[PDB]
Amino acid sequence: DFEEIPEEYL
Amino acid sequence: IVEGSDAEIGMSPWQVMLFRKSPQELLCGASLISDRWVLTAAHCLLYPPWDKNFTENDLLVRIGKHSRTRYERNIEKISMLEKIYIHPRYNWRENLDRDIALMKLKKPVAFSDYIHPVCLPDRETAASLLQAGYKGRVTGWGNLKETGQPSVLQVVNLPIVERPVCKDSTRIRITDNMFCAGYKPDEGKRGDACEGDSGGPFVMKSPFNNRWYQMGIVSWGEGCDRDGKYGFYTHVFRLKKWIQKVIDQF
Amino acid sequence: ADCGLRPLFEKKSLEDKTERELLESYI
Ligand SMILES: CC[C@@H]1[C@@H]2[C@H](C(=O)N1Cc1ccc3c(c1)OCO3)[C@H](c1ccc(C(=N)N)cc1)N1CCC[C@@H]21
Ligand code: NA
Numbered sequence: 132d133f134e135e136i137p138e139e140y141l
Numbered sequence: 142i143v144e145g146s147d148a149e150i151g152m153s154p155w156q157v158m159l160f161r162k163s164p165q166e167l168l169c170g171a172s173l174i175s176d177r178w179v180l181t182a183a184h185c186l187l188y189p190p191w192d193k194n195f196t197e198n199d200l201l202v203r204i205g206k207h208s209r210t211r212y213e214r215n216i217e218k219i220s221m222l223e224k225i226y227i228h229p230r231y232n233w234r235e236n237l238d239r240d241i242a243l244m245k246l247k248k249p250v251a252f253s254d255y256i257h258p259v260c261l262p263d264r265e266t267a268a269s270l271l272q273a274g275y276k277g278r279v280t281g282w283g284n285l286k287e288t289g290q291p292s293v294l295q296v297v298n299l300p301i302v303e304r305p306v307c308k309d310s311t312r313i314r315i316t317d318n319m320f321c322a323g324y325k326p327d328e329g330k331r332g333d334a335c336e337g338d339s340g341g342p343f344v345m346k347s348p349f350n351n352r353w354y355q356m357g358i359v360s361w362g363e364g365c366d367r368d369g370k371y372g373f374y375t376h377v378f379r380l381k382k383w384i385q386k387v388i389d390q391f
Numbered sequence: 392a393d394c395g396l397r398p399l400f401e402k403k404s405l406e407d408k409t410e411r412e413l414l415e416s417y418i
């Protein structure tokens with residue numbers, strides 16, 4: 132259930 | 142956190158969430174102690190019986206958070222790990238003695254209303270505050286019960302327990318590098334850390350200078366909020382010489 | 392220098408809802 136974080140952090 | 146309550150906004154601005162990249166999940170709690178150093182439990186990172194051995198690249202630190210699952214745009218900050226340092230004598234074989242680790246961030250995090258470092262105790266504040274019956278505060282996004290999950294950061298205040306009572310509560314060999322906290326069954330009140338709260342801080346507000354100090358790290362327990370059991374915490378002051386060494390060397 | 396003083400509480404002289412419980416325990 133975690134909201135997506137900006138791809139920049141991945 | 143079991144039998145705690147919702148945190149207020151900005152109540153624990155040193156709170157850190159350790160977040161796994163893939164699959165995306167809550168790994169543990171942690172603490173901000175400067176603009177580039179995060180403190181957590183060794184077991185959050187390394188635990189060979191369960192084949193746990195994370196590398197820097199495996200996780201993220203999320204700072205400034207309140208909601209557990211939401212991406213808190215314009216409020217949280219997400220940071221990459223440069224390096225993990227685990228206590229070289231962390232005893233994962235036997236009792237989790239010296240359950241402590243440091244993470245250095247790749248870049249300094251900017252402090253804000255929601256992001257601010259906690260103090261680390263010196264001898265005198267530990268001597269003054271780490272007393273049976275004195276209460277500290279534990280915070281985290283861990284489970285609400287031993288056997289759901291919170292929408293926002295949880296908080297519970299818990300009294301430090303006498304070392305003999307800690308010892309008599311468990312068959313584990315306890316060391317001077319651990320303390321326990323929690324109410325006794327006849328005290329009526331409840332509360333404990335639980336799965337997901339691991340690595341997060343046990344803090345106390347000095348009545349001498351009105352500053353918050355992190356006296357412990359959520360380390361282990363038997364179940365959560367069980368009558369006759371206590372949460373165990375890494376004794377931060379007792380390992381401070383290693384913390385200083387690491388930060389001074391790196 | 393500034394460690395342990397929260398922007399939304401100590402810096403503004405606002406108390407959180409249970410910090411006084413801790414104070415009362417410090418006997
Ligand atoms: C990875 C450790 C695990 C950790 C913490 C725990 O207690 N362990 C079990 C344990 C305990 C004592 C030990 C040990 C393992 O090996 C030797 O000494 C931790 C944990 C559990 C309960 C509490 C608590 N009730 N306050 C605090 C922390 N759990 C939750 C998920 C990870 C797991
Ligand atoms: Na015992």
Ligand code: NA
Pocket residue numbers: 323324333366367368369370371
């Ligand atoms: Na208990």
